[PDB]
Every structure is written in C-alpha cells, then in structure tokens.
Symmetry: C3
Subunit: 173 residues, 3 copies
Amino acid sequence: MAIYEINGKKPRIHPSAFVDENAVVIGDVVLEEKTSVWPSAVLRGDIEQIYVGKYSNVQDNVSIHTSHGYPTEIGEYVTIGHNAMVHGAKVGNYVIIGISSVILDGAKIGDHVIIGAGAVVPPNKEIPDYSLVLGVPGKVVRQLTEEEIEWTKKNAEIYVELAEKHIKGRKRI
Amino acid sequence: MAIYEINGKKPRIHPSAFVDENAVVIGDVVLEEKTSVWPSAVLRGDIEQIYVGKYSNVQDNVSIHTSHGYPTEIGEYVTIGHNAMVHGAKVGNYVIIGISSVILDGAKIGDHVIIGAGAVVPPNKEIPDYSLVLGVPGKVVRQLTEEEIEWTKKNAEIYVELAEKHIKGRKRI
Amino acid sequence: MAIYEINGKKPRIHPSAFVDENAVVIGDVVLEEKTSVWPSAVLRGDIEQIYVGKYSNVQDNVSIHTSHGYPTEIGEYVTIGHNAMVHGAKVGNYVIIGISSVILDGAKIGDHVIIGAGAVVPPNKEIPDYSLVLGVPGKVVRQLTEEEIEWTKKNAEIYVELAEKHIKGRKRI
Ligand SMILES: [Ca+2]
Ligand SMILES: [Ca+2]
Ligand SMILES: [Ca+2]
Ligand SMILES: [Ca+2]
Ligand SMILES: [Ca+2]
Ligand SMILES: [Ca+2]
Ligand SMILES: [Ca+2]
Ligand SMILES: [Ca+2]
Ligand SMILES: [Cl-]
Ligand SMILES: [Cl-]
Ligand SMILES: [Cl-]
Ligand SMILES: [Zn+2]
Ligand SMILES: [Zn+2]
Ligand SMILES: [Zn+2]
C-alpha cells in the first residue's frame, strides 16, 4: 500500500504478502507470509504493534489500531471482513471477523470463531473456541457447525489465491 | 478514482459517471450513466461482476464486493450510504442503503426500499418492495410512507447533481 | 491529506492540524488548532460546512458529511472513532463518538458524552450532557462515571500528542 515508518519503526512485510497501494500501513506492523491488505484498509502501528499472522487477510476499508498496553495480535487464516475494525485485541487462528463488526481492547477471540456482521465484541471479552458471536454487546449464541468450521479456513485460502492474482495481474489505467 | 484492470477485465465506466480519484475501482465493474463513486469507496470486481445502474451513487468509505456465484447488481436511483457494505447482493431500483449498513450474499432487495442505518440484511434474505428494514438481523418493520417513497428517488437525484458539481468544480490544492 | 476546493470553497486548516495525506478533505471544511484527520478519513464539505473544533480528532476510515440545512459542527476535545460516520449533526465538547457508530442529521450531542461502538443516534435525537448512549436506535442508558468523564478529555489529549508525532516523524517508504 502506501507504506510508512514512524520514528524508529518500519513495517516488517513478508515478500509474499500483498499490500494494495491504496491501503495504509504505518510503523510497527508485521505482515507474515501470504497475508493480504486490501484497498483503503488502514493498519496504524503508532502506539503498540499490530501483528498479522500467516494466511490472514485484512479487507477493504478495515481499520486496525491499538491502545497503550494493548497491541493487536492476529493469528493465522484470519479473515478480517470489509469495513470491520479491530482495536487492541487478540485474535486466534481460523477466525472470521464479520463485515463491519468491531473488536474492542483487551478482547481475546479464540480459534475457529465467527463474529457476525455488525457485531461488537466488548473490551476484555473472552470468546471461547468454536463460537458464533452475534449482537451488541456480542454474545456467544452457539457453537459452530462442521461446515462453518471448514469455512473458517476456506475463506482465508480463497484470499491467499486472490492476493496472488492481484500481485501478478493488477494494472492501473 | 484510482482505476484498475485485473487480468482480462477493465471497468466499463460511462463518460458521465463521476469516480473520485480517491475511490478504488478494480476489474469487472460496470458504472452506468450519471452514477457516482465517492472518496475512499471501493468496488472490487475481482471475483464476480459489480454492476451499478443509472443514477446510482456509492458513497464515501463504502465497500462493494462479491462471492463466487454471487455477483453484486445494483439498480437505478440507488443510494449506497456512507460506510455501508454490499456483498454479493441484488439491489433493486430506488433503494436507500443506510449509512454503515450491511447487505449480505444472496440477499434480494426489492424496489422502493429503505434499509436503516446500521442494519444488516442476512444472506439470502428477500426484502419486498416498499419495505423499511431495521435491525440485526434486518426485519421489515413496516411499509414506506409516501414521503419516504418520494425520497427514495430524490436522494439519488441530489447526488446526480452533486456528481456534476464535482466533475466541473473540484480542484486539488 | 489530499485536500480539495470545490467551486468557491477552500478548506480552512490551522497550521498545527495534522491531515494525513491519505485523508480526503473537500470544500467547506474548518479544522482548528491541534485537530487531526487520520488515514482514509473523508470530510466532504460540498453541501453545508463541516466544522471541527480545537483538540478534536477524526479517525481512520471515518466519513463526515452533511445534508441541505444541516451542517456538521464538532466541538472541542471530540474523538470521532475509527469507521464512525457523522452526518449533519451537532456534537458538543468532550464527546467520544464510538467506533463504527453513526450520528444522523439534526442530532444534538451534549457535552461529556460517550456514544458506544456501533450505536446509531437517530435524526434529530438530542443527547443530554454526561450521557452514555448505546443501541440502535441509540438510547441514553445511564450517566457517565467520573472515570469516563476524565476519559472524554484524555482520549483527545492522547491524539493531540499522536498528531504531533506523525507531523514530525512520518516517512513514506
Ligand atoms: Ca518464515
Ligand atoms: Ca477508506
Ligand atoms: Ca465502516
Ligand atoms: Ca504461487
Ligand atoms: Ca445508454
Ligand atoms: Ca449537465
Ligand atoms: Ca486561534
Ligand atoms: Ca509541540
Ligand atoms: Cl458470551
Ligand atoms: Cl422480514
Ligand atoms: Cl434516550
Ligand atoms: Zn484507536
Ligand atoms: Zn468479500
Ligand atoms: Zn451524505
């Protein structure tokens, strides 16, 4: 994307990662292998670090930030849905963060979790593995089905391929 | 906006359309006559096509995407509110998509419909004509009034004029 | 940010304000001393004026707009959270607009108010001072605590310092 350093920090971006030139990555941000950051997404690492694990995607118009003492750590095969916002939270592996949802400071999202579109996970809220979270404040309404569990990985894999397609075939006109 | 092709697809944009240079239009996207795409809006046509009918506007920080087998088709005189997100859905004519609302895959929004701000239309949800939709999950709470019906067109017309004003009078400083 | 005039209006920006180059400021917009506009934020002053008072911040992916007869006026020490949207509303001093929340036309937000993440303040809704607002439609659920009241200022002060850090230490790479 448009990539920036701020005072002593430069983003650490794996060569295989896709960062749309219209995305904004600033400071203390780590993007691992096969990650992807889409148009208009903002990863502002000007306070605590923002870490994005392997095979994870940060979709269009998403914002990721932190609070003092609350870094944002994202696991592997994580899908951060369009227009969602993650703030100073810990997100496990195989997690689908719903479109336009919000994850607040201190929250701990387990593995194989789906956060519904528009849901808001309150500060310090701990979400167990295999949970479906809906509402504002977000509640665990039930456990995921086998189909949804397979989807928590599939969604991310689709993006890994999409990222490569953009890396190789995008052309500004 | 910042316009891009991806592998064999180039956006088809009508000469009268306004696409803010800060918007992002990629791939298989069709923008008809008198449409407008505002700052920070993202129309990513990298899977299925995104079609935007005549006199329709896609406001600031909006994201439009699709899923395999689920293209996004927008009708005429449609207002896609600031920060809203439309994903693989069919939207009819004279529809006001509320600010920061979400329309999910397979949804079919009828004509002369108003989706409230922050509402979430679930996947495959069918919304009848003349409906007011509120909530998460979005429910049809009542039919529109005559004033609201006239507004479903007026809102779009205001934007058609606004688009022309920007086309002719915008200047970067 | 990317700054623009539209027909006779040029933004009035105080020398001390920070406007990220990835933000979009258009037309009739006033940004006072020590204000800050972050990446992907959009302040579109193409209808009525958008005024942002001293020490206030407009975070990443936020959109601010107006309606005919409804300008947007923001007071001092106001924090407009990531991905929030303010439309033709009046916001007082020491107000925290929650992440991904929505403030609609004609709304009047009092001083020392916290709007919860994802909440939607309905058109013409008046929120009294020292209120905590939650829900859709947004309701005053209780008065703020002393800690929250001190936070309504602290949040903004953190940003004033952050803005200066970016003004002096940002570097594109
Ligand atoms: Ca390695
Ligand atoms: Ca944006
Ligand atoms: Ca948003
Ligand atoms: Ca390969
Ligand atoms: Ca024609
Ligand atoms: Ca004309
Ligand atoms: Ca002064
Ligand atoms: Ca100083
Ligand atoms: Cl729970
Ligand atoms: Cl219904
Ligand atoms: Cl109330
Ligand atoms: Zn923040
Ligand atoms: Zn998508
Ligand atoms: Zn508007």
